[PDB]
């Protein structure tokens, strides 16, 4: 099917919270793209809002390019850069073990992605392995972040006035990776994206988190069991047997005030110092590059 003027729709490659992602071709350019479709008739239209957020992010390393936005027959349409597998996909291809070198290569880029988003006045609020994709081709060494479906301003674009503190919020994001503040019903801020990344990094190290597979009768009960397990698992127990930097990182994120500007550069330098003490080189040879 012909979308915009120059895009050809192929097969489905994905489905997130809303719409579906299709392989496409930019017929004019001779380049594969991803095409997100959302039915115009949907109850809660979100694609137009997501495309506005992606457009505010344009210019960032590891932000997918938006090529075209519009509406065609029964669909709202966003055409984007075609990206590669998620970090969850790659984790499965690597038998659910990342080498320390791969985890540190990823940590460096993922802290930078989240910083960049924060610099554009947004928090992501869904930091998880599924929402980071490696690029394709010449972008194969770049970690991209996607899924701005839960993203929101944490400060006025003009004043940089931080949103107010609020409590009794429902859980927003993914239970497995949610900050303790999010579990307690506290408004998400910059610290919560970085705390979530801290759990993603220990998830890669361990192969699973100690609050996975908790039996419960309800979603809310499941979320509360996850909350209780996270709050009762000391960071030094979570991170036992792994370089202290992972524990230092999580202690720093948990110490941040609601409206604190994280020291991104300190957090990157933690991992970078460990990377150097291990004698690793920043050559972007990830575990999955070794797959024969």
């Amino acid at each position: 099917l012909r979308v915009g003027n120059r895009y050809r729709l192929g097969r489905k490659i994905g489905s997130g919270s809303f719409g579906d992602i299709y392989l496409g071709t930019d017929i004019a350019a001779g380049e594969e793209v991803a095409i997100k479709l959302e039915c115009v008739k949907t109850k809660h239209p979100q694609l137009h809002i997501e495309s506005k957020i992606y457009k505010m992010m344009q210019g960032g390393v590891g932000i997918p390019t938006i090529r075209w936005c519009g509406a065609e027959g029964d669909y709202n349409v966003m055409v984007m850069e075609l990206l590669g597998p998620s970090l969850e996909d790659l984790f499965n291809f690597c038998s659910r073990k990342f080498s320390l070198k791969t985890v540190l290569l990823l940590a460096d880029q993922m802290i930078s992605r989240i910083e960049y988003i924060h610099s554009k006045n947004f928090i992501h609020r869904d930091v998880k392995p599924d929402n980071f994709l490696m690029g394709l081709g010449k972008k194969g060494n770049l970690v991209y972040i996607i899924d701005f479906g839960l993203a929101k301003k944490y400060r006025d674009a003009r004043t940089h006035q931080h949103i107010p503190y609020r409590e009794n919020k429902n859980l927003t994001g993914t239970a497995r990776y949610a900050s303790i503040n999010t579990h307690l019903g506290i408004e998400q801020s910059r610290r919560d994206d970085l705390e979530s990344l801290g759990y993603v990094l220990m998830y890669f190290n361990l192969g699973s988190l100690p609050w996975q597979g908790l039996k419960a009768a309800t979603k809310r009960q499941k979320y509360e069991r996850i909350s209780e397990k996270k709050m009762s698992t000391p960071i030094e127990v979570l991170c036992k047997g792994y370089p202290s930097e992972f524990a230092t990182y999580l202690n720093f994120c948990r110490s941040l005030r609601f409206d604190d500007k994280p020291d991104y550069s300190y957090l990157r330098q933690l991992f970078r110092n460990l990377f150097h003490r291990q004698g690793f080189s920043y050559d972007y040879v990830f575990d999955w590059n070794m797959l024969k």
Partner: peptide
């Protein structure tokens, strides 16, 4: 009963 995917599904919206 809750499906085991309750822990990994994205919940909420931009609000």
């Amino acid at each position: 009963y809750t499906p085991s995917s309750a822990s990994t599904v994205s919940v909420g919206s931009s609000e």
